[PDB]
Amino acid sequence: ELEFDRTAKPVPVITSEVTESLEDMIRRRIQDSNFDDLQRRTLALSEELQKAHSEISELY
Amino acid sequence: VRKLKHHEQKLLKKVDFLEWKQDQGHRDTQVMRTYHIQNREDYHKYNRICGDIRRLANKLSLLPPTDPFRRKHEQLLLDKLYAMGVLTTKSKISDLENKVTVSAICRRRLPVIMHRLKMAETIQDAVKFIEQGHVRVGPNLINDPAYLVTRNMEDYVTWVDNSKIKKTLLRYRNQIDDFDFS
Amino acid sequence: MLRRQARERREYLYRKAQELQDSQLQQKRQIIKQALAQGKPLPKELAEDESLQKDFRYDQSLKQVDDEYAATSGIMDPRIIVTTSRDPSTRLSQFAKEIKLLFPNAVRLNRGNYVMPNLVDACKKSGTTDLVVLHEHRGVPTSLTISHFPHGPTAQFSLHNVVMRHDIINAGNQSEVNPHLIFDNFTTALGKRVVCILKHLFNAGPKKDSERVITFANRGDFISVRQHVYVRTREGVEIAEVGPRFEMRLFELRLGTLENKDADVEWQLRRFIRTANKKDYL
Amino acid sequence: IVYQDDQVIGKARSRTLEMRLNRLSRVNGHQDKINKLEKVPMHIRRGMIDKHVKRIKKYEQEAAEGGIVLSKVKKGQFRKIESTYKKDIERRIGGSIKARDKEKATKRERGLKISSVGRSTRNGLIVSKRDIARIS
């Protein structure tokens, strides 16, 4: 029973209390409905300005 | 012409038969020799368009900055020039007045684009191979070396089939499949 | 094709190095926008150079989804491919079907006597979004690599705690609807990067009352994912588990595809490091 | 009001952008670099400034004819008015004439002091009695 140095936490053990804390997190997020889902991608003012708009439009 | 002495050089400070102020520092023949274009008016034909891009550059800037008509417009022109290949940057818009250049528009010609794809030894030997009828853009070969190749169209410039310019290339690799008479 | 994919990868990588130089100029142009509005002091180096002063008269007209996914973010629905490593056992042949079932718009083609250059040439041919190949260790699965195809980033994961639907009972059939996604506790810069490398694997715009939820929990440097179905009762939502529990953690994220294995490593897991056990996403 | 760039249109919008930026660069930047002159030769720039001050001295006697509280400016620079505003000639003139400003701001060398005993006054040189007592 000596002691030494270790490198990393292992794969965390899936138990009852970890899953019920995760599934309470799911319950709270479904109630607020804040699912991080990929949103479906949508899509006369002044006579000098219209004259400036028309000059750049014909030049384009 | 006689490497004129000091007492007449001060009298003749402003004379030069070789360099005049309208000749704009001889930037015509400087970019002509670097990129090897044939005739004489082709540099200035690009300069009218490269001046017209700069004319639409300044005329876009008297407009207010948060103008929705402006907000659509130069990004449409930037994508046009990016697909042209003359400017190779989408971030800045001040590049559409500064980086828009005849040397930017003449490196998208055909014989320079050979040299960027390393298909020719020099920038001049590309003009020799284009004029002899070796180079095609898709199905058809083009003989005029003053062809601007589109940024999309840059991918497809190969040698023409059944040609002696291709046979030497494949013979070094020991790859000649002469069923396709290449 | 092969010239085209080589051509657009050159224009993309130069444009990455162009905005790297532009980020200082974009930072400096932020100062011009603030100083012209609020705060009269202008710093020393930006004060002299009149080139930037004439630059801003144009550059006043300028203004996050990942840039490799910016074009195809929501304009098209991602078709994806699940494959096995080589000579699959029976268990991950079941398990690749369950990953295909968990993933909408997914197909499962068996891999035998293929070569990875010829596979990625075939999916660049027909056109897909990303590939998910699975390694294993005597039945149970161990590795899961997601590799986006138009010279997109690949992300290789290691998964340990795998329990699957074929093991337990004849539970019925999975929902196969377009699912909601629950993303939790992603905070780091790689956290936002690994969100976008994985959120785009599902179809765009699920329903308002879609009846299955796929949560991705970051609880303790392991992205842990479970699938659930749910109803809304009179007083509280009940949930019920379906499909594979995972205990997954990424170990490398190369900018290239999975065909390359010499590409630019954006991130790699470091474990022989004095601070490797200290923190997360390192 | 037409003060901001979002309602004004034209060269005036470009001119108020560089002017507001120049005074912001004035408060921190070095004046030998933040003031850059468009290079013009002798007889154009000398002919620029005499025609400029001819309109300035035209504006001077107009202010002398009708008494208005005019914006007082030191003679090292001219008066920034509407005439130079629409002409855009601050980049070719350089309103503070820097050669006459340098030779005016530089104090001249005085006489070479020798007699370090007392104070030079109207009554010749005045020394203290302590200086007399310490030298006697």
Side-chain angles (χ1 to χ4, degrees):
Chain A
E1 195 40 68
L2 53 97
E3 71 175 1
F4 56 94
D5 53 333
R6 302 207 181 87
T7 172
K9 313 149 289 303
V11 57
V13 47
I14 294 179
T15 47
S16 60
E17 70 270 14
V18 184
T19 48
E20 74 98 16
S21 306
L22 161 66
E23 275 163 356
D24 179 84
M25 180 267 273
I26 300 152
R27 274 172 162 86
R28 283 300 302 274
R29 289 201 58 116
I30 289 179
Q31 224 49 26
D32 201 20
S33 78
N34 53 357
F35 321 108
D36 289 11
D37 56 332
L38 198 136
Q39 79 58 20
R40 177 59 184 245
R41 169 88 73 82
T42 51
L43 281 85
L45 303 174
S46 158
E47 53 92 17
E48 182 56 46
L49 193 62
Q50 307 317 122
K51 171 196 299 179
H53 268 53
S54 195
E55 239 171 17
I56 191 168
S57 183
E58 58 93 15
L59 203 44
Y60 185 56
Chain B
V1 285
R2 218 189 56 235
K3 204 179 91 188
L4 66 159
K5 320 147 165 188
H6 159 207
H7 75 84
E8 70 262 35
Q9 167 263 8
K10 299 290 204 80
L11 261 72
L12 293 193
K13 293 183 205 167
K14 228 189 305 178
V15 306
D16 208 332
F17 298 102
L18 281 312
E19 160 33 80
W20 289 341
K21 202 179 229 170
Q22 53 65 20
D23 215 354
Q24 38 218 7
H26 271 266
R27 214 85 50 83
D28 40 1
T29 172
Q30 223 170 119
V31 77
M32 263 194 172
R33 286 166 278 136
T34 315
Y35 282 24
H36 199 81
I37 72 175
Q38 321 285 279
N39 43 21
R40 196 43 199 90
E41 301 315 342
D42 257 3
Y43 170 61
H44 293 341
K45 285 288 199 37
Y46 293 133
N47 227 14
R48 302 285 309 276
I49 285 181
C50 186
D52 203 13
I53 299 285
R54 281 190 192 175
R55 169 180 307 180
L56 217 51
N58 84 87
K59 280 211 196 303
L60 265 164
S61 38
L62 305 311
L63 257 66
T66 78
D67 201 297
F69 175 72
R70 187 178 181 214
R71 273 310 161 190
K72 184 251 288 182
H73 223 68
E74 60 302 9
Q75 297 71 359
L76 174 64
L77 204 147
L78 272 177
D79 270 88
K80 210 75 90 174
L81 295 191
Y82 194 15
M84 212 46 49
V86 61
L87 65 65
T88 170
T89 288
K90 286 296 294 181
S91 70
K92 324 173 171 63
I93 189 49
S94 312
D95 278 357
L96 171 159
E97 204 261 335
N98 300 327
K99 276 204 164 297
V100 165
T101 324
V102 195
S103 171
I105 215 174
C106 289
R107 66 178 48 113
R108 286 309 304 195
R109 286 172 47 114
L110 189 59
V112 195
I113 277 299
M114 311 275 258
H115 202 57
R116 307 268 182 184
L117 294 192
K118 275 169 295 293
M119 289 189 353
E121 181 57 341
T122 78
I123 209 166
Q124 182 258 359
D125 281 338
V127 157
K128 207 162 303 306
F129 289 158
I130 286 154
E131 245 294 14
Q132 287 154 334
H134 293 342
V135 190
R136 85 199 195 194
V137 192
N140 48 307
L141 78 94
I142 46 169
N143 212 358
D144 40 346
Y147 184 109
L148 193 89
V149 50
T150 294
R151 176 77 70 113
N152 155 39
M153 260 335 297
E154 191 214 319
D155 209 64
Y156 293 10
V157 278
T158 88
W159 301 112
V160 83
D161 206 2
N162 84 8
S163 62
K164 278 164 97 199
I165 166 64
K166 180 81 160 298
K167 288 188 92 188
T168 303
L169 182 163
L170 265 75
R171 258 177 55 248
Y172 169 80
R173 200 43 62 167
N174 246 314
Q175 174 194 100
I176 40 151
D177 171 43
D178 305 336
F179 165 65
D180 303 325
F181 43 74
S182 78
Chain C
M1 201 36 49
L2 51 100
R3 325 187 52 170
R4 159 83 63 231
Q5 294 295 318
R7 203 193 51 97
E8 68 182 2
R9 84 161 180 111
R10 283 203 74 257
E11 284 140 2
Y12 173 56
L13 259 67
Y14 164 57
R15 215 148 59 83
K16 188 158 302 307
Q18 180 82 10
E19 54 94 11
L20 170 149
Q21 278 182 28
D22 287 357
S23 202
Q24 291 88 3
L25 286 174
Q26 179 87 357
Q27 167 56 235
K28 259 67 172 179
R29 277 195 276 110
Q30 282 301 123
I31 316 295
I32 320 171
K33 271 180 295 185
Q34 299 142 1
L36 262 295
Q38 283 74 250
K40 297 302 140 283
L42 204 178
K44 165 63 42 173
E45 40 175 22
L46 201 141
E48 288 116 7
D49 39 2
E50 61 285 40
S51 77
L52 184 50
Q53 303 185 356
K54 292 312 177 301
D55 204 282
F56 190 72
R57 197 191 40 171
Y58 294 136
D59 268 10
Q60 208 157 2
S61 179
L62 276 180
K63 297 142 284 174
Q64 160 74 25
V65 200
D66 279 2
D67 170 44
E68 298 95 303
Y69 309 136
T72 181
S73 304
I75 68 162
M76 94 77 69
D77 275 7
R79 47 182 74 92
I80 45 184
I81 284 180
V82 181
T83 41
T84 180
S85 159
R86 172 74 77 107
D87 202 294
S89 293
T90 285
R91 316 280 285 112
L92 86 180
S93 175
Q94 271 170 173
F95 169 69
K97 200 151 179 185
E98 290 170 275
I99 278 300
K100 173 251 174 185
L101 213 56
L102 199 143
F103 274 30
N105 272 113
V107 301
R108 195 256 178 210
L109 66 98
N110 41 358
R111 172 166 197 279
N113 310 320
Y114 279 151
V115 278
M116 265 327 325
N118 269 336
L119 194 50
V120 305
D121 283 1
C123 328
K124 279 192 214 163
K125 219 175 166 153
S126 173
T128 50
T129 295
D130 54 84
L131 187 137
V132 181
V133 81
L134 320 171
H135 311 331
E136 62 103 16
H137 167 66
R138 212 201 268 251
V140 313
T142 45
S143 164
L144 189 143
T145 87
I146 306 159
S147 177
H148 197 265
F149 271 127
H151 63 306
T154 182
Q156 308 202 0
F157 297 82
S158 179
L159 67 158
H160 323 88
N161 295 156
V162 199
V163 304
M164 319 165 287
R165 208 176 27 98
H166 297 135
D167 301 331
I168 42 189
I169 41 169
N170 307 328
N173 302 133
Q174 285 185 203
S175 173
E176 218 182 2
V177 85
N178 215 2
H180 291 173
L181 270 72
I182 300 180
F183 274 39
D184 168 74
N185 213 5
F186 289 91
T187 45
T188 64
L190 198 75
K192 313 296 159 30
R193 179 79 195 176
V194 84
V195 160
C196 206
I197 213 169
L198 178 88
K199 197 191 275 225
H200 287 240
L201 268 68
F202 296 88
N203 315 334
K207 273 160 60 173
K208 198 136 207 199
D209 46 350
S210 175
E211 289 271 70
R212 76 171 196 171
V213 277
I214 314 189
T215 172
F216 287 78
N218 210 351
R219 296 157 52 123
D221 210 2
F222 281 79
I223 165 170
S224 87
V225 59
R226 283 95 174 278
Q227 181 183 190
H228 304 280
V229 303
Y230 77 106
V231 300
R232 298 225 195 181
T233 72
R234 274 89 69 191
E235 68 269 15
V237 162
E238 285 315 299
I239 53 184
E241 209 170 41
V242 64
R245 288 179 165 185
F246 284 142
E247 269 270 2
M248 166 172 27
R249 152 173 55 80
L250 76 153
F251 65 95
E252 79 178 7
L253 197 144
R254 317 185 89 82
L255 218 45
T257 51
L258 90 164
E259 90 163 275
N260 219 3
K261 47 163 92 162
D262 51 358
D264 317 332
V265 181
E266 161 163 8
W267 178 89
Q268 177 81 249
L269 179 66
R270 266 81 185 188
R271 265 170 56 91
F272 327 101
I273 293 304
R274 293 281 323 270
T275 178
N277 40 3
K278 285 290 179 208
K279 54 175 97 158
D280 52 336
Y281 284 107
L282 188 134
Chain D
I1 193 153
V2 282
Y3 76 103
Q4 77 209 6
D5 43 1
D6 265 339
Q7 60 228 359
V8 74
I9 167 68
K11 201 189 290 186
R13 180 250 160 193
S14 167
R15 267 183 187 147
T16 186
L17 173 69
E18 51 208 9
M19 172 256 267
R20 267 184 63 104
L21 168 161
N22 211 301
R23 60 177 291 172
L24 259 59
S25 179
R26 179 81 47 206
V27 303
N28 201 9
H30 202 295
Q31 85 299 357
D32 75 322
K33 298 294 121 173
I34 70 189
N35 288 21
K36 275 304 149 199
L37 263 298
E38 164 161 349
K39 179 71 160 66
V40 288
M42 272 330 150
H43 42 276
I44 302 166
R45 187 175 260 158
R46 278 208 283 260
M48 201 56 48
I49 60 180
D50 63 52
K51 276 294 297 296
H52 192 25
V53 302
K54 203 85 58 173
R55 304 186 293 275
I56 288 156
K57 73 189 272 273
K58 184 195 172 183
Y59 194 38
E60 286 295 329
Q61 46 57 18
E62 168 69 31
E65 168 141 69
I68 322 291
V69 184
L70 85 174
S71 61
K72 43 176 187 68
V73 55
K74 146 70 55 166
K75 49 206 196 280
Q77 36 266 17
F78 331 102
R79 199 180 311 266
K80 284 304 156 195
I81 44 176
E82 171 284 346
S83 86
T84 182
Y85 153 77
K86 78 173 289 288
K87 211 156 282 292
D88 200 5
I89 48 173
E90 303 88 8
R91 215 164 322 125
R92 303 161 182 86
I93 288 182
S96 272
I97 310 295
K98 83 166 185 187
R100 319 277 92 83
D101 285 321
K102 174 167 190 183
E103 275 307 301
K104 156 152 150 193
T106 296
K107 285 286 296 298
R108 293 300 178 188
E109 45 94 21
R110 290 179 168 190
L112 188 64
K113 64 159 198 292
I114 317 112
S115 180
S116 286
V117 279
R119 178 189 283 153
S120 308
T121 53
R122 155 194 200 165
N123 306 92
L125 264 289
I126 294 183
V127 309
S128 83
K129 191 50 200 71
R130 297 160 68 116
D131 293 330
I132 297 154
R134 78 174 47 167
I135 209 62
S136 295

